[PDB]
Symmetry: none
Subunit: 95 residues, 4 copies
């Protein structure tokens, strides 16, 4: 019921980590499609996180913030691109 | 690294609040299309937030979580 | 095993149609609660069906897929 | 647009395989909770699949149909039960 500002922040951070989980398992969900649809993507998330750290006095590169959001160097992730969609796996890769 | 657990929490929470704000301004983006593309929507966000509070020992209703994500009662947003 | 690819297709399709039928009769179960519990709902089913048709070379609209899953126009079900 | 009965069946089977994927990745989603909520679970799916095979003249045990739905012997799956929820992983297993 009655929650502290430290609880609100803990719940925001944790829900953010749930989102990150989720975008990592929906590796098929393209950033451009996210961009086109929703005006953000995993890159906007990395940038906003960078902005937050820089405002807190923590210097951080584009690629450091991306490793945080992606869970691996962004290069390791986007070269793990080339792969069938969930609906194409289901259609052709099973029976 | 040199970034403590509590710095991460700060940055993760700020980024979440910025997402929330950005979804409030992109009110033209339908939960349905977010769901069909990405497998989550504003209702999933409210659900994950509620589940986070529960996981931390704080019970919370479906409507409380939605108030938080939407920045208003859900039914007022539904308009 | 002794069960061919085409037997599987038969059985998988029949089980899907039985699920569909069972969700039509459990119209008291809200898409929202299905979504918050299981991470899918009747709208995800319609979306997956549309994506299956697309994956097979057949374009299909959001409303066509929903007609199939709901057994009626979505808006008529929304009532 | 205009689709054959063989296409309808192919799309039903494939959407069923997408569901099965999904329930396998949401291994945290309990059958009882599914039962309580929705009047079905992964066991009802196994049973219906069994009924369909038996009607097609294919004998199949309770446990064979379950291996089909679960993707592994049901024993290997339910002993891989005891594990933190997604929200508890996010809360306590990260920073
Ligand atoms: Mg972006
Ligand atoms: Mg959702
Ligand atoms: Mg859904
Ligand atoms: Mg059941």
């Amino acid at each position: 019921s009655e929650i502290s500002p430290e609880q609100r922040t803990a719940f925001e951070a944790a829900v953010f980590r749930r989102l990150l989980e989720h975008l990592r398992e929906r590796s098929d969900v393209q950033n451009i499609d996210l961009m086109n649809l929703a005006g953000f993507c995993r890159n906007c998330l990395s940038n906003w996180y960078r902005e937050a750290a820089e405002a807190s006095g923590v210097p951080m590169s584009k690629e450091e913030s991306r490793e945080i959001v992606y869970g691996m160097p962004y290069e390791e992730w986007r070269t793990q691109n080339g792969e069938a969609s969930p609906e194409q796996k289901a259609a052709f890769e099973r029976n």
